[PDB]
Amino acid sequence: QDKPGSAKAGGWTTYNTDNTFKGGSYAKYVLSPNLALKGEYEWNNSSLNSFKAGAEYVATPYLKTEVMTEYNTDNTFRVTVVTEGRYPVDPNLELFPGGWYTWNNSSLNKGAPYTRAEYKLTPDLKLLSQVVYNTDNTFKFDTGLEYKLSPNLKVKFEYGWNNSSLNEFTVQFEYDLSS
Known part of the structure; x- marks a missing residue:
């Protein structure tokens, strides 16, 4: 149905109590x-902004690979790889295999496991729960919700929770480009 050449836009508003x-x-x-x-641009009040860009390569129909490189004022900041796919689940809920990889020139490359769940708690919504567990102990925990009024545009609000940051509230804005 869709044709090539078209692009998609997505705004990200990160708000915190601070x-x-x-x-x-x-x-x-x-x-x-x-x-x-x-390409995702990250701006901030301070002079510590940056810009991350990369490409998305499809190796398999069930598993997809997306290389996301983070660029900064200097020659290079860091290159991270993300892996996502579609995994079946006994119940109605769905399981999405998440994979985070951090590669740099200073430190060594490491790929931590990622588990992303998506389903409807009850209502006609798409509750996306992201959990990161490690061999030692829990890494982080964050929740997300996907809802909208029309198919054209959509909106999602997810909040991150961990020892590092007390509580962060991020709201994404799904909107397809005009041209």
């Missing part, structure tokens, strides 16, 4: 089926 506020937006340019381009 005065410090974070804002950014990510978009994916689909030109060909082989691979697609991606």
